[PDB]
Amino acid sequence: DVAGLTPCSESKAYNKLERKELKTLEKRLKKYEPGSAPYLALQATKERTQNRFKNYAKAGLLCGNDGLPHLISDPGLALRFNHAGEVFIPTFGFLYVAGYIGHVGRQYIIKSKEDAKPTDKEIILDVPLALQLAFQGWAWPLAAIQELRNGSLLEKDENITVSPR
Amino acid sequence: GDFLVHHAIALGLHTTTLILVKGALDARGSKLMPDKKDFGYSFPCDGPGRGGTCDISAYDAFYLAVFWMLNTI
Amino acid sequence: KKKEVGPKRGSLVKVLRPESYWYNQVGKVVSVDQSGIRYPVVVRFENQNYAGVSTNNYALDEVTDPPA
Amino acid sequence: NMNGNWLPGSQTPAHLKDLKMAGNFGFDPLNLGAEPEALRWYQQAELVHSRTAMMAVAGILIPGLFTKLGALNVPQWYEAGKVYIEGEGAIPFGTLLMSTLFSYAFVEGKRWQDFRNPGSQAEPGTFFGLEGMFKGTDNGYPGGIFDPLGYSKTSPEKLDELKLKEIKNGRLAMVAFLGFAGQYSATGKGPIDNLADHLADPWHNTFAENGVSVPGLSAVEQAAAS
Amino acid sequence: AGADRPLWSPGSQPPAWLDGSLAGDYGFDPLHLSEEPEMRKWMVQAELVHARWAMLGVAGILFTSIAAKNGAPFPDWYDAGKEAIKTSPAPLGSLIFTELLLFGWVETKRLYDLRNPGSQGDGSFLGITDGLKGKENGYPGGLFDPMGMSKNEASFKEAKVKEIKNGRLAMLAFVGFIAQHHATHKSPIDNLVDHVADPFHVTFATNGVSVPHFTEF
Amino acid sequence: MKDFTTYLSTAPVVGLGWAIFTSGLLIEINRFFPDPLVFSF
Ligand code: CLA
Ligand code: CLA
Ligand code: CLA
Numbered sequence: 188d189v190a191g192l193t194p195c196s197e198s199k200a201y202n203k204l205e206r207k208e209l210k211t212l213e214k215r216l217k218k219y220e221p222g223s224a225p226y227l228a229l230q231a232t233k234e235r236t237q238n239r240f241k242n243y244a245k246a247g248l249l250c251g252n253d254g255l256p257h258l259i260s261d262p263g264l265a266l267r268f269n270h271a272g273e274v275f276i277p278t279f280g281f282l283y284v285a286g287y288i289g290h291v292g293r294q295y296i297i298k299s300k301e302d303a304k305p306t307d308k309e310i311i312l313d314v315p316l317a318l319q320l321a322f323q324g325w326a327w328p329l330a331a332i333q334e335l336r337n338g339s340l341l342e343k344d345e346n347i348t349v350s351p352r
Numbered sequence: 353g354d355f356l357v358h359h360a361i362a363l364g365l366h367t368t369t370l371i372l373v374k375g376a377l378d379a380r381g382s383k384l385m386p387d388k389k390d391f392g393y394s395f396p397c398d399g400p401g402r403g404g405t406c407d408i409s410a411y412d413a414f415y416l417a418v419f420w421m422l423n424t425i
Numbered sequence: 426k427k428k429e430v431g432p433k434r435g436s437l438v439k440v441l442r443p444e445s446y447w448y449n450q451v452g453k454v455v456s457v458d459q460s461g462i463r464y465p466v467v468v469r470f471e472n473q474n475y476a477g478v479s480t481n482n483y484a485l486d487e488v489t490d491p492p493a
Numbered sequence: 494n495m496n497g498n499w500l501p502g503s504q505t506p507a508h509l510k511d512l513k514m515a516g517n518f519g520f521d522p523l524n525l526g527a528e529p530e531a532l533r534w535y536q537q538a539e540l541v542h543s544r545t546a547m548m549a550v551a552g553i554l555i556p557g558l559f560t561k562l563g564a565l566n567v568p569q570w571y572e573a574g575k576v577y578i579e580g581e582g583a584i585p586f587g588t589l590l591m592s593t594l595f596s597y598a599f600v601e602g603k604r605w606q607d608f609r610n611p612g613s614q615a616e617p618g619t620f621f622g623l624e625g626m627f628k629g630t631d632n633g634y635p636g637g638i639f640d641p642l643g644y645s646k647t648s649p650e651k652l653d654e655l656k657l658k659e660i661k662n663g664r665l666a667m668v669a670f671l672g673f674a675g676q677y678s679a680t681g682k683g684p685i686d687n688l689a690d691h692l693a694d695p696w697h698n699t700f701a702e703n704g705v706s707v708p709g710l711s712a713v714e715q716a717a718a719s
Numbered sequence: 720a721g722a723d724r725p726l727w728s729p730g731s732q733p734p735a736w737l738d739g740s741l742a743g744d745y746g747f748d749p750l751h752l753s754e755e756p757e758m759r760k761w762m763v764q765a766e767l768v769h770a771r772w773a774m775l776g777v778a779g780i781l782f783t784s785i786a787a788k789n790g791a792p793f794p795d796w797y798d799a800g801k802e803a804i805k806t807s808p809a810p811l812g813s814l815i816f817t818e819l820l821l822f823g824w825v826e827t828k829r830l831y832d833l834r835n836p837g838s839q840g841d842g843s844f845l846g847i848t849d850g851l852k853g854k855e856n857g858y859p860g861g862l863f864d865p866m867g868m869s870k871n872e873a874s875f876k877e878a879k880v881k882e883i884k885n886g887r888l889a890m891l892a893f894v895g896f897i898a899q900h901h902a903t904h905k906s907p908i909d910n911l912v913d914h915v916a917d918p919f920h921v922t923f924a925t926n927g928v929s930v931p932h933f934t935e936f
Numbered sequence: 937m938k939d940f941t942t943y944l945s946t947a948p949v950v951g952l953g954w955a956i957f958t959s960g961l962l963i964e965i966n967r968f969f970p971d972p973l974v975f976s977f
């Protein structure tokens with residue numbers, strides 16, 4: 188009941204939206220014979236709509252004055268009101284995947300800059316090396332913070348090209 | 353929707369600020385144009401040399417940021 | 426002249442010229458002029474500039490050993 | 494040398510090939526233990542997580558086995574905290590949580606201080622005159638009152654054998670506790686009940702028979718049975 | 720075993736990487752696969768395991784179909800899995816994952832013997848050193864060869880040639896099984912007795928499939 | 937073959953392969969888990 192938002196299970200406009208979608212799906216369904224492929228496709232669409240409307244309920248979702256679900260944003264408020272999985276956990280998973288991609292790219296750049304003509308390796312990928320680094324990045328945050336600790340993650344400003352003042 | 357449009361406003365402010373401070377900080381020099389202080393504030397370009405140098409002055413950065421400010425407002 | 430005017434040929438050098446494209450960058454010494462010109466140290470770089478060139482002439486005071 | 498190979502025919506990492514380490518099997522495909530100090534921190538973390546694992550697994554299994562036999566009447570691990578909170582002389586959950594968390598803060602601050610500087614807890618006149626026995630022997634093996642029976646005061650080969658046994662039962666306890674959590678989340682019953690179900694009906698009771706562990710397997714079973 | 724050997728087509732030029740040393744080397748590679756030696760040994764291992772499973776499956780299918788024709792209550796090779804899991808004490812799901820569990824060990828050992836030859840026979844698996852050592856690339860021997868007729872080089876070579884030829888014939892047999900079961904919806908032995916009953920009429924052109932009929936005139 | 941393998945080792949081919957793999961993974965996830973919005977089991 189936070190932010191003046193009713194839960195989707197106890198909401199009123201949520202049910203109106205569900206009935207409206209089921210009504211237009213049934214209106215589209217009534218134009219076809221029961222033993223037809225469009226009938227089966229529309230029945231599958233109606234079943235998916237009902238399952239989505241049921242699964243959006245009984246999960247702590249809140250909607251305000253329109254039946255459209257709202258996402259609780261602040262952690263702590265989301266943690267104490269069963270809304271952590273709305274945005275708190277998805278950004279944790281996204282940060283994991285984004286750090287995976289960044290660490291794999293960093294490892295490929297560092298390992299490809301060692302050999303002669305690194306631009307050829309950049310534009311013609313070493314597929315076994317890329318796949319080896321792809322399956323070795325499952326522990327990207329530990330490795331990243333350890334390179335931060337030993338200083339190999341950062342480059343000294345004396346060795347970095349600097350625009351004139 | 354109010355939160356989404358406020359975040360879009362924040363995007364507009366941040367991008368216009370980015371253009372304006374890129375123009376201001378690189379006004380007197382840059383990697384492409386180290387001697388930008390000797391060419392004044394409002395000069396067209398340096399020609400097609402070094403890959404192309406159009407809209408390199410801080411005045412042109414301001415003139416792009418006018419578009420971005422118009423979009424933000 | 427005793428020894429040489431500039432650094433060892435083929436050795437890595439770091440460019441201290443601020444207006445140069447390769448400021449704080451490492452290049453290889455191709456040749457050092459012994460005549461006494463203003464910029465005798467010829468440095469070749471792996472990464473080309475916006476003009477597409479990769480070699481330049483620098484004086485003695487704008488080249489140092491690369492830090493490690 | 495090395496105790497054994499986790500994957501025969503695979504290239505052993507260089508940092509683990511010549512390493513004289515207790516319980517080493519070259520299982521670093523991600524090369525996390527490349528640095529020696531990072532290897533020391535990972536070794537200490539493995540030791541603490543292992544001791545965690547065996548303490549929790551023993552507390553889950555032995556009272557659970559006693560209750561299965563009928564000698565004890567304690568509940569299973571997934572509701573014991575719930576019933577203990579609802580006791581008639583029950584300390585509140587927050588009080589116990591913060592008190593034993595503060596006690597952990599004390600021991601773990603001591604552990605961090607003796608890791609970042611070995612033997613630094615033996616500073617004289619610090620802990621009631623008992624600080625002279627707080628000096629650690631090796632990485633993750635403090636000794637002293639942590640080993641009052643003196644079982645580690647033996648031959649070095651016996652010490653390495655004991656360390657290998659400790660880390661092997663520790664890793665077995667990690668996978669055991671992970672299995673406890675996973676198959677309680679899947680089946681919804683105790684670990685002894687799951688063992689009894691696997692013993693009575695091995696084919697019908699497994700991880701693959703339920704759609705929680707592997708989604709979509711029940712649909713394939715229904716399609717095959719149709 | 721090379722040079723003037725019978726090729727896949729007379730007058731063809733054999734590839735440089737196909738010198739006839741391998742079993743069944745007829746110089747047949749339009750797509751230039753197995754050019755690299757590592758990819759060549761990968762292809763040899765893949766062909767060998769596909770061949771062995773092809774002859775195993777084809778022999779099982781033929782045995783079941785022959786017994787079904789003779790009178791044993793055996794279903795067709797197609798849709799046999801349904802009645803199999805109907806009568807199996809082991810349900811599906813557990814069965815496939817059980818097969819994967821006792822298959823992963825053998826597949827891991829095969830893969831790391833292919834990548835590292837002789838590395839399996841080091842006593843790591845229950846103290847087995849002389850056994851589990853690959854005599855050739857895709858030919859382990861040892862515990863998989865209890866009777867030692869592969870000690871002679873000539874016998875080993877002719878056995879390799881016979882194995883790869885029967886394996887390729889088994890690939891063709893499995894493809895034929897799938898094709899004429901999709902065309903006739905009958906057992907392969909049923910197709911065989913139909914072909915030997917009326918050879919001049921019962922063929923691939925009279926099943927209503929394969930050759931389409933549009934005008935019927 | 938190795939010339940063809942280096943051709944597939946070029947950036948657009950591996951980019952197409954990655955795009956196909958990621959699109960197929962996301963599409964099969966969305967098909968077998970219809971309309972995911974709330975992280976619950
Ligand atoms: C459908 C889901 C979805 C999609 C498609 C995107 C798409 C995108 N996100 Mg977003 N994001 C999402 C959900 C999603 N996001 C959610 C749910 C959260 C949590 C609330 C975030 C939080 C987030 C952040 C914080 C950032 C992005 C960024 C990006 C963009 C580039 C990512 C990148 O560079 O490649 C993958 C990543 C790399 C190649 C380099 C790794 C860099 C990552 C961000 C660092 C991760 C480790 C870091 C130390 C953790 C702290 C982060 C720091 C901001 C505090 C891209 C347009 C980035 C962006 O736009 O930058 C301009 C960015 O900084 N996203
Ligand atoms: C994997 C390589 C890699 C890494 C580690 C970084 C890291 C960074 N970039 Mg860069 N970037 C990259 C590739 C990379 N970038 C590419 C390919 C482009 C061209 C599109 C850019 C364009 C770019 C801009 C324009 C900006 C950054 C910025 C940043 C910083 C913010 C973090 C972030 O996610 O930005 C967001 C990054 C992106 C949205 C770029 C994503 C591009 C693709 C989708 C990722 C490529 C992954 C690569 C193919 C993986 C190779 C693996 C290998 C095995 C094949 C950070 C230092 C920002 C900055 O300066 O912050 C301080 C900034 O303004 N980057
Ligand atoms: C950047 C903004 C943004 C954000 C945050 C989202 C987020 C979302 N949208 Mg939207 N969308 C966007 C942009 C965005 N989209 C755009 C630009 C378009 C137009 C092209 C759409 C069009 C669109 C449609 C039409 C639909 C969505 C849907 C969704 C949901 C997808 C969730 C999902 O697939 O399950 C979660 C999926 C995952 C977590 C993927 C798993 C990946 C991890 C890494 C695991 C990897 C798999 C595997 C285990 C890895 C190991 C194996 C591997 C080695 C092979 C989510 C709420 C769908 C929905 O349900 O809406 C609510 C839907 O119907 N969106």
Ligand SMILES: CC(/C=C/C=C(C)/C=C/[C@@]12O[C@]1(C)C[C@@H](O)CC2(C)C)=C\C=C\C=C(C)\C=C\C=C(C)\C=C\[C@@]12O[C@]1(C)C[C@@H](O)CC2(C)C
Nearest residue numbers: 520521522523542545546549552570573574667668670671
């Ligand atoms: C401490 C611990 C658990 C402690 C649990 C406790 C106290 C729970 C409390 C209770 O239950 C009791 C006791 C009794 C109940 O009445 C009450 C409750 C409240 C329910 C687990 C550690 C558990 C630790 C685990 C499982 C660690 C696993 C680590 C793995 C798998 C690492 C693998 C790898 O790192 C390698 C080795 C090499 C890399 O290259 C690759 C990867 C894969 C990264």
Ligand SMILES: CC(/C=C/C=C(C)/C=C/[C@@]12O[C@]1(C)C[C@@H](O)CC2(C)C)=C\C=C\C=C(C)\C=C\C=C(C)\C=C\[C@@]12O[C@]1(C)C[C@@H](O)CC2(C)C
Nearest residue numbers: 747748749750751752769772773776779796797799890893
């Ligand atoms: C046909 C085949 C492979 C054909 C490959 C060809 C033509 C390749 C040609 C080329 O490469 C060359 C030469 C050279 C290149 O330059 C060009 C190309 C063109 C690329 C493999 C079959 C391979 C066939 C195999 C492995 C068959 C396995 C069968 C099994 C396991 C059976 C199991 C059963 O389950 C069933 C199905 C049903 C149950 O009733 C019974 C049981 C027994 C349970």
Ligand SMILES: CCCCCCCCCCCCO[C@H]1O[C@H](CO)[C@@H](O[C@H]2O[C@H](CO)[C@@H](O)[C@H](O)[C@H]2O)[C@H](O)[C@H]1O
Nearest residue numbers: 234238704708709710712960961962964965968969970
């Ligand atoms: C690319 C990787 C994709 C994921 C791995 C491969 C696919 C594995 C199977 C995925 C689907 C398994 O199905 C599992 O989730 C479905 C998601 O709607 C749910 O499906 C079940 O409930 C739905 C309503 O909620 C009904 O419409 C379905 O008819 C019913 O089967 C069940 O929880 C379970 O059947």
